[PDB]
Amino acid sequence: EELTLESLSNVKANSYSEWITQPNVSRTIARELKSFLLEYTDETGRSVYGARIRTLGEMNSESLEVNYRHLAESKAILALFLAKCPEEMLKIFDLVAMEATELHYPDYARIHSEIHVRISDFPTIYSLRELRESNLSSLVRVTGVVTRRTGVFPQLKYVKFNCLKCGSILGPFFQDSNEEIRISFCTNCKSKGPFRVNGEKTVYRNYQRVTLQEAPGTVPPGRLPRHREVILLADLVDVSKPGEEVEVTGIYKNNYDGNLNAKNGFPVFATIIEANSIKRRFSWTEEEEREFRKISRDRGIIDKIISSMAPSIYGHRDIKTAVACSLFGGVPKNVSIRGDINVLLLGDPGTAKSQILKYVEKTAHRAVFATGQGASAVGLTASVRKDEWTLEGGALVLADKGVCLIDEFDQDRTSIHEAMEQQSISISKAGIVTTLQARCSIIAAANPNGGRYNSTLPLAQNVSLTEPILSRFDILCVVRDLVDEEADERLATFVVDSHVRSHPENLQRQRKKEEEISPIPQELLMKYIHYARTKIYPKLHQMDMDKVSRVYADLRRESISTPITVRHLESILRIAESFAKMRLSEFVSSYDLDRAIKVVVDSFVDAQKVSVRRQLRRSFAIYTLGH
Amino acid sequence: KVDDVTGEKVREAFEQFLEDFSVQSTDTGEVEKVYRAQIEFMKIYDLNTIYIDYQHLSMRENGALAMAISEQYYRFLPFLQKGLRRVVRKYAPELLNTSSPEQTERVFQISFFNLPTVHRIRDIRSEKIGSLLSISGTVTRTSEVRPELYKASFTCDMCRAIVDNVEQSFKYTEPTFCPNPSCENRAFWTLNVTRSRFLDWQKVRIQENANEIPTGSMPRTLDVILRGDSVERAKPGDRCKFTGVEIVVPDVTQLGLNSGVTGLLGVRDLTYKISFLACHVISIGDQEVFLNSLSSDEINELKEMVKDEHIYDKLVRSIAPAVFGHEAVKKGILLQMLGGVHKSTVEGIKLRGDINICVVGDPSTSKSQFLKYVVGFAPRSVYTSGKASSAAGLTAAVVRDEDYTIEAGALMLADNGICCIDEFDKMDISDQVAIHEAMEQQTISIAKAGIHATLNARTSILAAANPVGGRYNRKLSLRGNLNMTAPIMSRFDLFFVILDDCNEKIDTELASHIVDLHMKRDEAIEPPFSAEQLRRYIKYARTFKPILTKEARSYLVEKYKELRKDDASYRITVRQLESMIRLSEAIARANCVDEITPSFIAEAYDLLRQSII
DNA sequence: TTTTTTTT
Numbered sequence A: 001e002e003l004t005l006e007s008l009s010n011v012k013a014n015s016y017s018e019w020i021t022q023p024n025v026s027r028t029i030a031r032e033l034k035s036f037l038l039e040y041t042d043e044t045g046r047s048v049y050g051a052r053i054r055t056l057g058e059m060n061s062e063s064l065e066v067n068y069r070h071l072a073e074s075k076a077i078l079a080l081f082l083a084k085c086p087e088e089m090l091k092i093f094d095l096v097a098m099e100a101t102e103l104h105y106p107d108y109a110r111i112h113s114e115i116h117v118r119i120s121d122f123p124t125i126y127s128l129r130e131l132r133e134s135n136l137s138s139l140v141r142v143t144g145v146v147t148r149r150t151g152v153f154p155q156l157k158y159v160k161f162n163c164l165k166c167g168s169i170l171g172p173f174f175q176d177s178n179e180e181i182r183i184s185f186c187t188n189c190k191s192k193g194p195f196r197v198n199g200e201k202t203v204y205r206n207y208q209r210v211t212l213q214e215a216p217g218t219v220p221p222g223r224l225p226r227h228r229e230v231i232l233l234a235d236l237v238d239v240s241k242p243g244e245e246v247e248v249t250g251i252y253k254n255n256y257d258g259n260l261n262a263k264n265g266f267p268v269f270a271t272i273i274e275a276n277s278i279k280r281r282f283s284w285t286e287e288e289e290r291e292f293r294k295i296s297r298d299r300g301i302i303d304k305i306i307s308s309m310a311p312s313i314y315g316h317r318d319i320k321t322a323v324a325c326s327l328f329g330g331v332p333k334n335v336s337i338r339g340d341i342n343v344l345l346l347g348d349p350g351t352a353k354s355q356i357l358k359y360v361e362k363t364a365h366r367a368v369f370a371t372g373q374g375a376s377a378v379g380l381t382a383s384v385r386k387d388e389w390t391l392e393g394g395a396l397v398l399a400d401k402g403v404c405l406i407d408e409f410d411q412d413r414t415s416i417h418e419a420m421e422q423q424s425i426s427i428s429k430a431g432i433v434t435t436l437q438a439r440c441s442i443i444a445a446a447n448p449n450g451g452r453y454n455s456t457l458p459l460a461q462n463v464s465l466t467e468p469i470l471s472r473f474d475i476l477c478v479v480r481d482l483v484d485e486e487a488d489e490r491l492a493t494f495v496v497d498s499h500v501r502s503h504p505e506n507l508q509r510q511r512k513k514e515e516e517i518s519p520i521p522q523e524l525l526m527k528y529i530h531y532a533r534t535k536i537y538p539k540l541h542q543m544d545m546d547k548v549s550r551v552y553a554d555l556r557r558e559s560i561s562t563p564i565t566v567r568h569l570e571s572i573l574r575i576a577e578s579f580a581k582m583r584l585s586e587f588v589s590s591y592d593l594d595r596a597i598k599v600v601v602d603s604f605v606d607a608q609k610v611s612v613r614r615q616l617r618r619s620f621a622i623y624t625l626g627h
Numbered sequence B: 001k002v003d004d005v006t007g008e009k010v011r012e013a014f015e016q017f018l019e020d021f022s023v024q025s026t027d028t029g030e031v032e033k034v035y036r037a038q039i040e041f042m043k044i045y046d047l048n049t050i051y052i053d054y055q056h057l058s059m060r061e062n063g064a065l066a067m068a069i070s071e072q073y074y075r076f077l078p079f080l081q082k083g084l085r086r087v088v089r090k091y092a093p094e095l096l097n098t099s100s101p102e103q104t105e106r107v108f109q110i111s112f113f114n115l116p117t118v119h120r121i122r123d124i125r126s127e128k129i130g131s132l133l134s135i136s137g138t139v140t141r142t143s144e145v146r147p148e149l150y151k152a153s154f155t156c157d158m159c160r161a162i163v164d165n166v167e168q169s170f171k172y173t174e175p176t177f178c179p180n181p182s183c184e185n186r187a188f189w190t191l192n193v194t195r196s197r198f199l200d201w202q203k204v205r206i207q208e209n210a211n212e213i214p215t216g217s218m219p220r221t222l223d224v225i226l227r228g229d230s231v232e233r234a235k236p237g238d239r240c241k242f243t244g245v246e247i248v249v250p251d252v253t254q255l256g257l258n259s260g261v262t263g264l265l266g267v268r269d270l271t272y273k274i275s276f277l278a279c280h281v282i283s284i285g286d287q288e289v290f291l292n293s294l295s296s297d298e299i300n301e302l303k304e305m306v307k308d309e310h311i312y313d314k315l316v317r318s319i320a321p322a323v324f325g326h327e328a329v330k331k332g333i334l335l336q337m338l339g340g341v342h343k344s345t346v347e348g349i350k351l352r353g354d355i356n357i358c359v360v361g362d363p364s365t366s367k368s369q370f371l372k373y374v375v376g377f378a379p380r381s382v383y384t385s386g387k388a389s390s391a392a393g394l395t396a397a398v399v400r401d402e403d404y405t406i407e408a409g410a411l412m413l414a415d416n417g418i419c420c421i422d423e424f425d426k427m428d429i430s431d432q433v434a435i436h437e438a439m440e441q442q443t444i445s446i447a448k449a450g451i452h453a454t455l456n457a458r459t460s461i462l463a464a465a466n467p468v469g470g471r472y473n474r475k476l477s478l479r480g481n482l483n484m485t486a487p488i489m490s491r492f493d494l495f496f497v498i499l500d501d502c503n504e505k506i507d508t509e510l511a512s513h514i515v516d517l518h519m520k521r522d523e524a525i526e527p528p529f530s531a532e533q534l535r536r537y538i539k540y541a542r543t544f545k546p547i548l549t550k551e552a553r554s555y556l557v558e559k560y561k562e563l564r565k566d567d568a569s570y571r572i573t574v575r576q577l578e579s580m581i582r583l584s585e586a587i588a589r590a591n592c593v594d595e596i597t598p599s600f601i602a603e604a605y606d607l608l609r610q611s612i613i
Numbered sequence C: 001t002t003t004t005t006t007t008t
């Protein structure tokens, strides 16, 4: 006999699981679950789970998305039961998924013999510290940043064995993913013995563990962050990468180990979470695609973007232009033409250069921020440690088409050398020669010669970077703490206004808060860069490139007059492409090239201030400013 | 079984002390049976532990029960718990059960509190083993809470006979003989995790206090153990008193899971390690919510010095009462302690509101006493000498404990509070750079050692250095008069440079002041306010959130222009304007005004101008 | 990793 859902309400069992394991109870639970899946629908009346099954089959995904609220909306009794005893109802609901999927996709078992239920929107949430033994053996929704990840190694999903004494075959016991089997007995002969695993009958599931550490902000001030390990199983394996904030939902399991016992001298059990559903806490959409396409216009769209670059920072319009061009970047032409735009941001200390770099960090879809002193050249490149024996990558490698914010300019220097020469990182650590293609943009900043900039002596003399390093930068930027009462007053007004607007006292008010300091909304802009880089691929204008050729020849003549390189030409081309991209132009126009010419000519002018600056100004007044 | 008639007598006396205590100060001597009332509250909230004052049980039954329990707490604990269950049945039978499926037995933790005395770590003696005592000290280390297996349950893997309610020793214990007489399984005890009940547990390490046995000795340390609600009950690195019993920890490895006792173990010996099992933990080290926390008289006093308008000057005077002179420097203390409004702009850029002060004085300027008062009077305050200090110990350290892990440094030890840095001049340049990046980021990231963790590291820094050559050459410039990386100079909010003066009158005054400081010792000093009063007012001000004013916006912009002109910029930058705004915030907090006042900006402008010298 | 004489 089967029971009613109201009958299920009467647990009438020693434990919630004890109630669930009841056979008729299991039947009722399965029937109700299938009823929910087929019946529960969005307010629209469409079976959200029906469409989910459709996609699941279509994508061949082996994990079925599930929203906790949906069951809480209907059959909430089962929601509570699952919360109390997640494992049992997870198994039952997985079988329900078997049945729901097969009816719509008969014989889907071929594609995936099994499926995995993925609960979502679990109401209760706890931090690692919040976790308590009461929480154990129940589902928990937790958040953090993954500290370390291990490679996805196979694990024995199902296991048969063979008693050495007789042991023809032993049952295909299901491995729990947390402990060994240790049957410690033989059915063929009633006794213990070496139970050799039966390679004939065994199922293997992808296995993985990643350590999770409490988010810094989540940590109470002064309190020490804590971390727990969460085992990732097949499908869920390799979802996120170390150093990434993530939220997960799994059973807070535990187990015994004499290791900790002796370590703490007490009978205490290690606690681990078996992730049932992972979630990482930007991407544009069709609405944003079409919106960008409209707003993409000749109406100072470049100028508007620049105005929205580091809006919290006053002036520095040239710097804003350079950083915008770096963000959008330029199309690479491999054979090996670099497409990245490496920009250095030399300035007097306290000139907000670090702040604009951080802005880019927030404004960058992918970027790596490091400190020349607080960042390791090994951490920039790679390192090797026992996993066992394994290597790890470096920050520069971690930058993959993503701007590499850096400043505070040894081993780091040569690492950059190899990086700038070719966007890849060679390494022979542990006698294993290999390379790591970074292929990423770079942003640099520093204090000239560790002191106030000196107009006298060229920009290179104002710094200590080797000339190769200087040249391989797509462009260089100089900032000087010159004093002007009018400019100082404007800066003071801007700063005080910034403090006032930012003061906590001052959500819907955000629209007035932005104060139109940025012509375009920041989010729309971020999606703008992402969409443009993904889709916009400027095409150079050969007919215009002839004028580019003669212009570069003129620049070479003037360099001989008092030092240009083909690298300068390539930088001009790259930044022209970036100009085209900022306005969603897949065809580079003469105006892109004009802006590129002006910018690169300025970056050349920064050389030799007191020496030649005036002469260069007179020579190039038409090339850079004339139009 | 063993009668332990004394044990059951203690059980009876204990239940009668829990139910018939019949004592309550509320409504004067009117008796409420405060333990029966605590049982009622227990039913209200359905907790596990029962808080029991030692003094209450002491006055109970002449304290003979207190004496007996305090000695043989270990022996009496099962009897006490059984009596507590009996009392629960008598009055809270619902709580008797854990309280849907069957609800198991509810464990009650008898956490005695308010002991007669606290014995120091070195006061610990084997004689006290198992006796209920209380220990004070700061928490040097702690552990993640983990589920100790209180009551164990095993299914007999040969007949399926299930065992339950098996108390575990230090080593993981298992059933020896199957309860089913028909079965004869002596092993193969698959632990029934579900049936078994696990209590929360946490190891905690503490060290001896400075004024405990400082005489020629290294501060002794103890490993106390938190259990039940006590777990996590206390924060790390804080002086607290832990009441509990002295527990002897045998080495499980010897148990099997100088020499030791044997011939039991059997042939194996056994070596022990004393420890402590805490039962109760007590720490001893919003604006309206803060007022609520205050007492009525405390609130009145708060209002009293709030009404005072000289309050600002009197507070500055109270600062470093022992220290004489250097009133602007004391003002700097007060302002830094008050801090400033930290804010993250709409773009998200975090704007620090904290103030990091620097001091450059010749030797004997009492800057040492200055920092001593600061840290002593400042919560979340860490003091260190730059000459002798390690970066990791100052910011954060990586250690391996079963396994790579992290150890907080000074910045962590005082994040979100004072960070005193003595002998800064002597401090390592690379370590100075580590701090520079850390403080500027208001963040510390442990990228090395494989791990890439990061911590808030937000705090205020009171740098204390001496001028190069032990004397500040006024001909030279601050940048150059002292060895320190200029960019870190940029982000030091203040620079109190202390010079010597041959003013005979001042010399006489200071000499008399010091000689009185020795003659009358404590009587010599007399600050306007008590340090506790000062802290209460300071926290109240912290509750305030200064807001900038139109007149204040103006006054600020002209004053910054004037400063730029004055340097006309080696020491004047946008950082200086930021510090100006922060100083305005601090002044308003001292004024306890939610808004900024051009007078406040004038004060800050004078402060920075003097700092420029 | 951190601390550490000692030599290179």
Ligand SMILES: Nc1ncnc2c1ncn2[C@@H]1O[C@H](COP(=O)(O)OP(=O)(O)O)[C@@H](O)[C@H]1O
Residues within 6 Å of the ligand: A312, A313, A314, A315, A316, A347, A348, A349, A350, A351, A352, A353, A354, A355, A356, A494, A495, B574, B575, B578
């Ligand atoms: N154009 C500007 N607009 C706004 N603030 C500025 C500007 N230039 C400098 N600053 C201020 O200078 C301060 C220090 O800048 P920072 O990023 O530390 O420069 P650096 O990287 O050289 O140390 C910042 O807080 C910033 O507010």
Ligand SMILES: [Mg+2]
Residues within 6 Å of the ligand: A350, A351, A352, A353, A354, A355
């Ligand atoms: Mg900076």
Ligand SMILES: [Zn+2]
Residues within 6 Å of the ligand: A163, A164, A165, A166, A167, A186, A187, A188, A189, A190, A191, A193
């Ligand atoms: Zn066999």
Ligand SMILES: [Zn+2]
Residues within 6 Å of the ligand: B156, B157, B158, B159, B160, B161, B178, B179, B180, B183, B184, B185
């Ligand atoms: Zn048995």
